[PDB]
Amino acid sequence: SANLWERFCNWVTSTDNRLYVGWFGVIMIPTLLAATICFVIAFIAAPPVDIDGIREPVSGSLLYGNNIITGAVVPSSNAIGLHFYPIWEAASLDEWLYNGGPYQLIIFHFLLGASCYMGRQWELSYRLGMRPWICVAYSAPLASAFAVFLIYPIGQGSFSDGMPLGISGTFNFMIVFQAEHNILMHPFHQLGVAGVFGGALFCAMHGSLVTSSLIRETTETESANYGYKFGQEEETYNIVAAHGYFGRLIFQYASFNNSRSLHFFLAAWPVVGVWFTALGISTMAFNLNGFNFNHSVIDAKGNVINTWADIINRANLGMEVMHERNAHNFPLDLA
Amino acid sequence: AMAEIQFIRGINEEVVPDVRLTRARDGSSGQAMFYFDNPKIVQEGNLEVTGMYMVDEEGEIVTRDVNAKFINGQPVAIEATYTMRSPQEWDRFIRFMDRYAASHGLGFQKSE
Amino acid sequence: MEPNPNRQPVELNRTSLYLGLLLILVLALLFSSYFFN
Amino acid sequence: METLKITVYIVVTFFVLLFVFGFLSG
Amino acid sequence: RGWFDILDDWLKRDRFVFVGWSGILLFPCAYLALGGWLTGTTFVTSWYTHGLASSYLEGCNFLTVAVSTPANSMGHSLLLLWGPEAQGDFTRWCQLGGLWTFIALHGAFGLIGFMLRQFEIARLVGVRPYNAIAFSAPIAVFVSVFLIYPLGQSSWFFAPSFGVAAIFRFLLFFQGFHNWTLNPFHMMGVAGVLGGALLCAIHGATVENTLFQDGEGASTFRAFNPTQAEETYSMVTANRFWSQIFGIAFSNKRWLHFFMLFVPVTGLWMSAIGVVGLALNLRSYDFISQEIRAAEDPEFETFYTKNLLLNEGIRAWMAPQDQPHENFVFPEEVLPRGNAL
Amino acid sequence: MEVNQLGLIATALFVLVPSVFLIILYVQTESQQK
Amino acid sequence: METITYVFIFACIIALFFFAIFFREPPR
Amino acid sequence: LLFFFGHIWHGARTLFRDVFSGIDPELSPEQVEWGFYQ
Amino acid sequence: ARRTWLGDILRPLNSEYGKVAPGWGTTPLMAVFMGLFLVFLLIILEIYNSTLILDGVNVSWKALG
Amino acid sequence: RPFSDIITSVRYWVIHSITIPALFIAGWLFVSTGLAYDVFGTPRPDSYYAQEQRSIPLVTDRFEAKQQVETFLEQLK
Amino acid sequence: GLPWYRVHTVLINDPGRLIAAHLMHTALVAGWAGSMALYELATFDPSDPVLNPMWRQGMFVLPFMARLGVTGSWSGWSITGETGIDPGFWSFEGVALAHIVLSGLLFLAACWHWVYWDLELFRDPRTGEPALDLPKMFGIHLFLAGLLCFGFGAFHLTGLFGPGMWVSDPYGLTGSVQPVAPEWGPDGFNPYNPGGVVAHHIAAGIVGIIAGLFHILVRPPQRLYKALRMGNIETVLSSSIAAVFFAAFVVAGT
Amino acid sequence: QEPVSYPIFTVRWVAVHTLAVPTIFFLGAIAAMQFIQR
Ligand code: CLA
Ligand code: CLA
Ligand code: CLA
Ligand code: CLA
Ligand code: CLA
Ligand code: CLA
Ligand SMILES: C=Cc1c(C)c2cc3nc(c4c5[nH]c(cc6nc(cc1[nH]2)C(C)=C6CC)c(C)c5C(=O)[C@@H]4C(=O)OC)[C@@H](CCC(=O)OC/C=C(\C)CCC[C@@H](C)CCC[C@H](C)CCCC(C)C)[C@@H]3C
Ligand SMILES: CCCCCCCCCCCCCCCCCC(=O)OC[C@H](CO[C@@H]1O[C@H](CO)[C@H](O)[C@H](O)[C@H]1O)OC(=O)CCCCCCCCCCCCCCCCC
Numbered sequence A: 001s002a003n004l005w006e007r008f009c010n011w012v013t014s015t016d017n018r019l020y021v022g023w024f025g026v027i028m029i030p031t032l033l034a035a036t037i038c039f040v041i042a043f044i045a046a047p048p049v050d051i052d053g054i055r056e057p058v059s060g061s062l063l064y065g066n067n068i069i070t071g072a073v074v075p076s077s078n079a080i081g082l083h084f085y086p087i088w089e090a091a092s093l094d095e096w097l098y099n100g101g102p103y104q105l106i107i108f109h110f111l112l113g114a115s116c117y118m119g120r121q122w123e124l125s126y127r128l129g130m131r132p133w134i135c136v137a138y139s140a141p142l143a144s145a146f147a148v149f150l151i152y153p154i155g156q157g158s159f160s161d162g163m164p165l166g167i168s169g170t171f172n173f174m175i176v177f178q179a180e181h182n183i184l185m186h187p188f189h190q191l192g193v194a195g196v197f198g199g200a201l202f203c204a205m206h207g208s209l210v211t212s213s214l215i216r217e218t219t220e221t222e223s224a225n226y227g228y229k230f231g232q233e234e235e236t237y238n239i240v241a242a243h244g245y246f247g248r249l250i251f252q253y254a255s256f257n258n259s260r261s262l263h264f265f266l267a268a269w270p271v272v273g274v275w276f277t278a279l280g281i282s283t284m285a286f287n288l289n290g291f292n293f294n295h296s297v298i299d300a301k302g303n304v305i306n307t308w309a310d311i312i313n314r315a316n317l318g319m320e321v322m323h324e325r326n327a328h329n330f331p332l333d334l335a
Numbered sequence B: 001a002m003a004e005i006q007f008i009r010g011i012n013e014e015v016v017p018d019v020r021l022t023r024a025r026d027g028s029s030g031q032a033m034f035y036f037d038n039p040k041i042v043q044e045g046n047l048e049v050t051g052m053y054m055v056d057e058e059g060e061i062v063t064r065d066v067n068a069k070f071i072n073g074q075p076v077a078i079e080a081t082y083t084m085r086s087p088q089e090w091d092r093f094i095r096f097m098d099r100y101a102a103s104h105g106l107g108f109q110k111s112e
Numbered sequence C: 001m002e003p004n005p006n007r008q009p010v011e012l013n014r015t016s017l018y019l020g021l022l023l024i025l026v027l028a029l030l031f032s033s034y035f036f037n
Numbered sequence D: 001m002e003t004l005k006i007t008v009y010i011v012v013t014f015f016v017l018l019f020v021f022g023f024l025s026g
Numbered sequence E: 001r002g003w004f005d006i007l008d009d010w011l012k013r014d015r016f017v018f019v020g021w022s023g024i025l026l027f028p029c030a031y032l033a034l035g036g037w038l039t040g041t042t043f044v045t046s047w048y049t050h051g052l053a054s055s056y057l058e059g060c061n062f063l064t065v066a067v068s069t070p071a072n073s074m075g076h077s078l079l080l081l082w083g084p085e086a087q088g089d090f091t092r093w094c095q096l097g098g099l100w101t102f103i104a105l106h107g108a109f110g111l112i113g114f115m116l117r118q119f120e121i122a123r124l125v126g127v128r129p130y131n132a133i134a135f136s137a138p139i140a141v142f143v144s145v146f147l148i149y150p151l152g153q154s155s156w157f158f159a160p161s162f163g164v165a166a167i168f169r170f171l172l173f174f175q176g177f178h179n180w181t182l183n184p185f186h187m188m189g190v191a192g193v194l195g196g197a198l199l200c201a202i203h204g205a206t207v208e209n210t211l212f213q214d215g216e217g218a219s220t221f222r223a224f225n226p227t228q229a230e231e232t233y234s235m236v237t238a239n240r241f242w243s244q245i246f247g248i249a250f251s252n253k254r255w256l257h258f259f260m261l262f263v264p265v266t267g268l269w270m271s272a273i274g275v276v277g278l279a280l281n282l283r284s285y286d287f288i289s290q291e292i293r294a295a296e297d298p299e300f301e302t303f304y305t306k307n308l309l310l311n312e313g314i315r316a317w318m319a320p321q322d323q324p325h326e327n328f329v330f331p332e333e334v335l336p337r338g339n340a341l
Numbered sequence F: 001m002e003v004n005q006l007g008l009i010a011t012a013l014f015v016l017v018p019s020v021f022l023i024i025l026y027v028q029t030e031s032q033q034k
Numbered sequence G: 001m002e003t004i005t006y007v008f009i010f011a012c013i014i015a016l017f018f019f020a021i022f023f024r025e026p027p028r
Numbered sequence H: 001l002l003f004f005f006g007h008i009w010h011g012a013r014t015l016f017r018d019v020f021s022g023i024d025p026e027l028s029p030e031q032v033e034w035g036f037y038q
Numbered sequence I: 001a002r003r004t005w006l007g008d009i010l011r012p013l014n015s016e017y018g019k020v021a022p023g024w025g026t027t028p029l030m031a032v033f034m035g036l037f038l039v040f041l042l043i044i045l046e047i048y049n050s051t052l053i054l055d056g057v058n059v060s061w062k063a064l065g
Numbered sequence J: 001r002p003f004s005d006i007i008t009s010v011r012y013w014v015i016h017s018i019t020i021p022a023l024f025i026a027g028w029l030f031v032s033t034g035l036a037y038d039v040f041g042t043p044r045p046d047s048y049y050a051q052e053q054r055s056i057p058l059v060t061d062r063f064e065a066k067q068q069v070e071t072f073l074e075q076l077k
Numbered sequence K: 001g002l003p004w005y006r007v008h009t010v011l012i013n014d015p016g017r018l019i020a021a022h023l024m025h026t027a028l029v030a031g032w033a034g035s036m037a038l039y040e041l042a043t044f045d046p047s048d049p050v051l052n053p054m055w056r057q058g059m060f061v062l063p064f065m066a067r068l069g070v071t072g073s074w075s076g077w078s079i080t081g082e083t084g085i086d087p088g089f090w091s092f093e094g095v096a097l098a099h100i101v102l103s104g105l106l107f108l109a110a111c112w113h114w115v116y117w118d119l120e121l122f123r124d125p126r127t128g129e130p131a132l133d134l135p136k137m138f139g140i141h142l143f144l145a146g147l148l149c150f151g152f153g154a155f156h157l158t159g160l161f162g163p164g165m166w167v168s169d170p171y172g173l174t175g176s177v178q179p180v181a182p183e184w185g186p187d188g189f190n191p192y193n194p195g196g197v198v199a200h201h202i203a204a205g206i207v208g209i210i211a212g213l214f215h216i217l218v219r220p221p222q223r224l225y226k227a228l229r230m231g232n233i234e235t236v237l238s239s240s241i242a243a244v245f246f247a248a249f250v251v252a253g254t
Numbered sequence L: 001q002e003p004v005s006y007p008i009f010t011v012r013w014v015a016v017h018t019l020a021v022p023t024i025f026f027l028g029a030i031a032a033m034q035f036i037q038r
């Protein structure tokens, strides 16, 4: 009656539905469905996974005697490397599950889906006649997703060095990463931490200031829509105290006295912070490390005077000697 | 005039409010709501509200609790409130109001 | 006797209920692993 | 098992074909 | 008018910097706190309290200087300059770590003066003081870690020192001896702080792209700077957007702006509860069931069991120089190593 | 492994008691609408 | 009995998701 | 520590009673309205 | 309200309910009590923390018996 | 006065162009002649150890802290 | 309507209903103490106190009763190490039964005050609104606290009509409850000396009597009243949380 | 407002003058530390 191709093409591109489904959504839905469903089944009942290629597997499943804080989906074995490794690359299913294929399936499907999610955000904003670049803010978590699941494995040369999908898995990754690349002393993670503490601070401040200022808001509302005048009352006086202390410096730092820049600054601060730390983990995949201060101070008799950084380097040795089982004679390593 | 309302020191307001003067039980307490509808302070200027100043030649009596009403982003009216709680403040307020209501005009209404 | 006049109805809407239930279940899931240790 | 390999090629090309023949219809 | 009234109205003039009754507690204490950090991270040694160097005069750079803590034998001492340890000698007072306490205590009362300043400022303009209440999350953190925690330890020596590398050290220390990542209260802290950063980015972006006055020139003539914004965007376009992307949205601006306040603050408060719990060394260190199951079957292996081995390592290889007053000597045959399993 | 009965009851009351408080408050709120 | 508790409470969270999306209040 | 937050919140509600409420308790209930109009 | 045998006995003790004495009244006395208390708390704190020492005082489990 | 014309007045020039170098040179001389090493008790750049023993100093008492560290300082420890 | 976190904002202008609510909380606390005491007693074992003391069996409320003079059991066992004593009516069991009885009484009395919530006394005689006299109330209650502080020190602690308190030797080999006379020297602020604690109670109860008399005869100054917002019952609440959390830190520390 | 009279001893005068003289003294010292021979 309207030629099913246009009924399909109307129904998809509709902005009248409960949840938008886009042209990107047509790729987002099966990839996310695969990733989610494989993760639930795997977090419950994935068989133990040989991850080092020594034939000693690491458990990760609730039914095998874990709770959820000790569970994880365990990355693929050290024999796989960067090889593509689908189901039909195994000659039986139980060796596929033993080699940690489920992890690879999940992480590829999720990465695809995340990019489609960003794409769909751009599409609805275009459709409703909005401004774009809410997705540009969303590229900050996508960037870190990329760095920790794709870029850091390629640099190290194996998908067995990626972040496990779990609670204790994530913390194990953090500990063994600090041990070898010394990231606290790397500036890009520092710009990241600054962004996150600053984001929390500016979030708290914005909430408190606005939520005392607003008295009441109102809009007339009808039986399926909203009204004609979005009305609000806000207080509009203040003292020279706050103007001379806080106001003078936000207006000087925006280099504009418009308060339009306030929300702008609000969006920009965590995002940029998180961009730089996403750069950190990427460049550290290519074995460029953070600072190390060793024997900064020695006396004039040739005896080293310790610093507060030497205590940290001792813990780096501590963690690192436990993280090689490979030989006693590991001389110069990675990669 | 002999009575002015200023929001910034020495900046007169030309737009005259109607004032609702409500009486807290037998007069020694009460409160006045000043209503300015599209004044000139909501269309122009960048200098702040520092409080609504009622000035006469008894001095100034300053008040906080000035609000704005917005329609879709445009501020369109200013509402302000002065809450006095002693008869002293109230006879003072009535003297100011007498000099104001005469000088910007006009009558003054009462209903019981 | 004669009614108290400070008696007031209590209100709770559906969206608050959903947040509250989300809070109950999500804390319960975080702490069950320590309750069984 | 290579019927599954065959099947996966078929069913995913089918979805990217929907996506891009819709993105050219606009 | 009496002299009190004259003093009071001198303090509350409109001026560039607000003095106030609260100013009297804030400003000297803040100056001395801050300035003590500076004078100490430039000149004062720690060769006598830890066996380290930590100031510029000795050699160090910006990340590796610190004002460091006292020695372990000093107990929970106040470390007064007139106390019975210094005895009126500014040199010994610097040498014994006496000014760590100076900085800490003066900064604590500086905190108190700041929150009072927020109250009476907000009292002056006559608005609700939620920001003073928000600011008690930073006070909770400060007093639970820098004051209460070592008061549950045996000395101030196990308190964190003011400095970049010293607190990087605190991170690795807690990881090793408390396994602080596996504590539900720090997890609730992480969720809160990350959620704050999430709301911050999402709100900024949403508002900046639902602006009014995208076509003809600004029909907005005020700010009215104390309103922050909220007039400059349309609630309905953003709410309509997020109902389709994510399937739930806020329809009330006041409750959105209250959520943004609630999240980081409850976050900090919960992590404070956890660390005041670590102050009596009660530790959610291990799941009892996992330990039993690993003892009876030694082919069981978990990402968690690895973390325990790694922490054993942190402790064993960091201890002798981090606690050089204990005189740990570990022959190398007793330290733990991967190739020995 | 261990199976606490006390853990079973601890979680049971932790999820049952506040939730029933919540749904009772909702169901008696809706009957004030008419 | 422990694994049961984990999956049960998760089952409850996704049911909560469903109702909070398709059965939310009208905006009045 | 939790009771410390309690003190701060309830002191806020005491000193700022007229800000959390609409009507200053320094007035009696309001009775007859006078205006002023042009 | 009702009349009661105990209500009217306590009635004189609750019939002021808002009366102030004019001015600052007896505030200076309060001040010096508050100052003496500040000093007192510092003393007993400094005895406890053994940065103030008095002879015949050993802050130790010794001298219980 | 405001900080928007505060370093444009003849006052700024006439005083600060002499007091700035004076106290800056004072700050140089403080370190250059080694007075700081005696005021805060910083050890000289080759007095971290005695020649008597090669152990690090750590005060193991709080009320005899003063003469203990004086004993360490005696031997150049 | 009222939000779920604001359902006790109705007792604010209601003296009678508030007294009833406070009475309910008192009843619950007394009930708790009694029933916890019985629970711990049913699951205790004093056969061997030398290689399994009471804090190894994890007794929480049982030490607190033992500090101030309960030391027996109607079964006949002692925690001193003795076997075969009669502590009279006052054993651990005795005080548990006492507390349960007092919870019942308090519960009835709460119900009464909630039914008879409106009386002449609670209303201002000038307009029919709730009226409190918050300074006079503090003075009277202070006088009661002082009377109790003095009695507890002079009769119970020194054992002039009481059992006394737990005294020890520094290494915990043999301790028992005995009479303790005070110490007014500079050695009474040494917290390792029971005499100091008794002198504190004697002295502080006397200061309490005096301050309680003071606060009945003197009305607050005009400036402090209108500054600190007196006559608002929510003032007393902030102040009392402050005192209480101070007191919490000091007990945790000691 | 805030018209100018304001002689030598004012609040903003002592504010710039208790942050000025130690910062410039410390740059004087941090500078001489660079030319230590250790
Ligand atoms: C103006 C604000 C101010 C405040 C609030 C403080 C507060 C403090 N200073 Mg101080 N200080 C200040 C300015 C200030 N100072 C200035 C300008 C100087 C330079 C001259 C100093 C010099 C200084 C030194 C040298 C030291 C301190 C230290 C300390 C404290 C450390 C912890 C401790 O043991 O306290 C203990 C408590 C006290 C010291 C408080 C005593 C309180 C008094 C005098 C109350 C008297 C009340 C009243 C008058 C009595 C009336 C009685 C009458 C009716 C009979 C205490 C928190 C000490 C420190 O850091 O140790 C680690 C220390 O050694 N300060
Ligand atoms: C002291 C506090 C502290 C703080 C504040 C931080 C802060 C940070 N660290 Mg850490 N860190 C610390 C201590 C700290 N660190 C210590 C001591 C160590 C040493 C052991 C480390 C080791 C460390 C490492 C090794 C790494 C970090 C990273 C990060 C940051 C990356 C940005 C981010 O948040 O990405 C968060 C990252 C994400 C990927 C989150 C987004 C996820 C997506 C897109 C999910 C969306 C789908 C979702 C699941 C579905 C929802 C459905 C539901 C609603 C129904 C952040 C800046 C990481 C980084 O830089 O990453 C790039 C990283 O690799 N840190
Ligand atoms: C990766 C993610 C991540 C995130 C998001 C967090 C987040 C958090 N962690 Mg962390 N942590 C992590 C990973 C993470 N952690 C890991 C992997 C480790 C390794 C073990 C740690 C180790 C760790 C420790 C050891 C501690 C935390 C704590 C905290 C929290 C306390 C709040 C805070 O920031 O206080 C930060 C500090 C403040 C709020 C105080 C600031 C005070 C002020 C006002 C300074 C002002 C200075 C200024 C110059 C003055 C100017 C004056 C002038 C105007 C005159 C925060 C919830 C802390 C906590 O739980 O405390 C309760 C704590 O002690 N974490
Ligand atoms: C010391 C006694 C005390 C008293 C008498 C009150 C009384 C009041 N508080 Mg307050 N409060 C206290 C301590 C106290 N609080 C402490 C210590 C804190 C800090 C954590 C708070 C934080 C607080 C806030 C932030 C608010 C109140 C509010 C209220 C009032 C509103 C009505 C109401 O009761 O809601 C009743 C019900 C609730 C508040 C929720 C109850 C369900 C909870 C969360 C507890 C579940 C049981 C509990 C965990 C069991 C163990 C308790 C333990 C002590 C044994 C009421 C006047 C509100 C107010 O002023 O309204 C006008 C408001 O916004 N209170
Ligand atoms: C739009 C939805 C969508 C999309 C985009 C994908 C995309 C992908 N899926 Mg798939 N999948 C989907 C839906 C989808 N799937 C659904 C609904 C199911 C259930 C039936 C599956 C079941 C599924 C399985 C079982 C697996 C995947 C895997 C993969 C990929 C992983 C990345 C990789 O390493 O590729 C590497 C591949 C390339 C670089 C090129 C791929 C070339 C294509 C698609 C066609 C080959 C054509 C052939 C040579 C000539 C014509 C043959 C004729 C018979 C038609 C591939 C890109 C695999 C995976 O993750 O393995 C770990 C895997 O094993 N998917
Ligand atoms: C003859 C006169 C006399 C004498 C001999 C004493 C003797 C005593 N009084 Mg005193 N007192 C008196 C008259 C007297 N009083 C009068 C007339 C008043 C006014 C009415 C007071 C007011 C008073 C107060 C207010 C206090 C005492 C306390 C005490 C002592 C209690 C025993 C103890 O454990 O102290 C050892 C305890 C201290 C010395 C307390 C020091 C103060 C602080 C804040 C310690 C906190 C430490 C730390 C930060 C907490 C960390 C917690 C963390 C680990 C989690 C000591 C025996 C104190 C008490 O209750 O102690 C339990 C207390 O605070 N008395
Ligand atoms: C490390 C992280 C961190 C820092 C550095 C920080 C810093 C600050 N927060 C402030 C405010 C706030 N913070 C808030 C929420 C938060 N703050 C958080 C995390 C932080 N907040 C978090 C996570 C939140 C969210 C809940 C709020 C809501 C506020 C404010 O309103 C307030 C403000 O004005 O913001 C603009 C400012 C108070 C300025 C002032 O007058 O202090 C006075 C302090 C004095 C006088 C003493 C401080 C203590 C001292 C002397 C010792 C510490 C050590 C020294 C600084 C020495 C250097 C140490 C090295 C480690 C570098 C200041 C810029
Ligand atoms: C002691 C033994 C006896 C105990 C018996 C009592 C049991 C105690 C029951 C009560 C427990 C407290 C109730 C708390 C739940 C209700 C909250 C509520 O109603 O809020 C709503 C309340 C009040 O909200 C108000 O509601 C009013 C109508 O009632 C109006 O709508 C007001 O406008 C609105 O402000 O606000 C809050 O409490 C604010 C905080 C809400 C916290 C929600 C957190 C976010 C959701 C959960 C976290 C999701 C993220 C998880 C991420 C996981 C990733 C792995």
Ligand SMILES: CC1=C(/C=C/C(C)=C/C=C/C(C)=C/C=C/C=C(C)/C=C/C=C(C)/C=C/C2=C(C)CCCC2(C)C)C(C)(C)CCC1
Pocket (backbone or CB within 6 Å): E031, E032, E034, E035, E036, E038, E039, L019, L022, L023, L026, L027
């Ligand atoms: C302690 C004490 C005290 C006090 C003292 C004080 C208070 C001090 C002060 C001090 C101070 C207060 C100092 C300051 C300092 C400063 C500094 C340290 C600076 C630095 C620098 C900067 C900041 C800059 C930089 C830069 C930039 C930024 C850019 C480029 C260029 C340059 C690089 C140059 C007393 C007497 C009581 C006695 C006892 C003890």
Ligand SMILES: CC1=C(/C=C/C(C)=C/C=C/C(C)=C/C=C/C=C(C)/C=C/C=C(C)/C=C/C2=C(C)CCCC2(C)C)C(C)(C)CCC1
Pocket (backbone or CB within 6 Å): K028, K029, K030, K031, K032, K035, K100, K101, K102, K103, K104, K105, K107, K108
């Ligand atoms: C959980 C928890 C908690 C809480 C808890 C609670 C809160 C509880 C409560 C409890 C309770 C609170 C209980 C009580 C009980 C009671 C009882 C048991 C009683 C009974 C009684 C009776 C039976 C009586 C009777 C009578 C009467 C009525 C009259 C006459 C007389 C008689 C006696 C016969 C806490 C925080 C701690 C911690 C964490 C956890």
Ligand SMILES: CC1=C(/C=C/C(C)=C/C=C/C(C)=C/C=C/C=C(C)/C=C/C=C(C)/C=C/C2=C(C)CCCC2(C)C)C(C)(C)CCC1
Pocket (backbone or CB within 6 Å): K102, K105, K106, K108, K109, K111, K112, K115
């Ligand atoms: C008719 C009626 C009713 C009923 C009523 C009744 C019958 C009530 C009861 C009530 C009661 C039943 C009350 C009671 C009160 C009293 C008491 C509760 C007392 C006790 C005492 C004691 C316990 C003491 C002790 C002591 C002291 C204080 C001091 C020193 C000495 C001694 C220790 C001995 C009702 C409600 C249903 C309603 C309807 C009608």
Ligand SMILES: [Cl-]
Pocket (backbone or CB within 6 Å): A172, A176, A322, A323, E306, E307, E310
């Ligand atoms: Cl490992």
Ligand SMILES: [Fe+3]
Pocket (backbone or CB within 6 Å): A206, A210, A263, E203, E207, E229
């Ligand atoms: Fe905003």
Ligand SMILES: [Mn+2]
Pocket (backbone or CB within 6 Å): A156, A161
């Ligand atoms: Mn590796």
